[PDB]
Design a protein around this ligand. Structure first.
Ligand SMILES: Nc1nc2c(ncn2[C@@H]2O[C@H](COP(=O)(O)OP(=O)(O)O)[C@@H](O)[C@H]2O)c(=O)[nH]1
Ligand SMILES: *S(=O)(=O)c1ccc(S(=O)(=O)Nc2cccnc2OC)c2c1OCCO2
Ligand SMILES: [Ca+2]
Ligand SMILES: [Ca+2]
Ligand SMILES: [Ca+2]
Length: 170
């Protein structure tokens, strides 16, 4: 009767594509104007490797500045998409902070977690090399996936692969 419920949290600095990724996955639309301060949770039934499950996506928008509350939101999460923009080096640097915040809360270096380099359709504006992102993912023992919320490239992949990590590890 009870479906598996995979609780995903989108994290990353501003403008990297957390909302665009979420809305492409959820509604098959590229949304370019989503209020930067608007957070929202999304729930969808999805057939993961043949098994009907529910995905819950918290699309965080950076507004929770009270550390105890931010930690409470992270504690509820089971897996994390840690998103940066390949076109903004500072957003790649910022991923280290989200990682530390998650590890402090989850107390488990194997917490389901993907490093997501978004905006792969802007290769001509790339500021973060594939090599250096792959090297960071290797240091953290996480997979690195490049996505485009615009073209849909690897959007389903990051959500499904994160659910597969939640399924396997929890
Ligand atoms: N070209 C391109 N633009 C993107 C992509 N993802 C997001 N954007 C744009 O980047 C801006 C910020 O995206 P948003 O999802 O709101 O970022 P958030 O602050 O992380 O939620 C918007 O104008 C989007 O259209 C992408 O994959 N490719
Ligand atoms: S809550 O009232 O359900 C709530 C959810 C999300 C957000 S946020 O996404 O804007 N901020 C964050 C959520 C989780 C982790 N980190 C952040 O920002 C750093 C809220 C929020 O309550 C109000 C504030 O933001
Ligand atoms: Ca669960
Ligand atoms: Ca957003
Ligand atoms: Ca779809």
């Amino acid at each position: 009767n009870s479906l598996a419920l995979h609780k995903v949290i989108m994290v990353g600095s501003g403008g990297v594509g957390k909302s665009a990724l979420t809305l492409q996955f959820m509604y098959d639309e590229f949304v370019e104007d989503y209020e930067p301060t608007k957070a929202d949770s999304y729930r969808k039934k999805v057939v993961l490797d043949g098994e009907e499950v529910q995905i819950d996506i918290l699309d965080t928008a950076g507004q929770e500045d009270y550390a105890a509350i931010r930690d409470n939101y992270f504690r509820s999460g089971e897996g994390f998409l840690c998103v940066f923009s390949i076109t903004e080096m500072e957003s790649f640097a910022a991923t280290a902070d989200f990682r530390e915040q998650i590890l402090r809360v989850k107390e488990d270096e194997n917490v389901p977690f993907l490093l997501v380099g978004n905006k792969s359709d802007l290769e001509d504006k790339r500021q973060v090399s594939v090599e250096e992102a792959k090297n960071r993912a290797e240091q953290w023992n996480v997979n690195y996936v490049e996505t485009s919320a615009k073209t849909r490239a690897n959007v389903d992949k990051v959500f499904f692969d994160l659910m597969r990590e939640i399924r396997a590890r929890l």
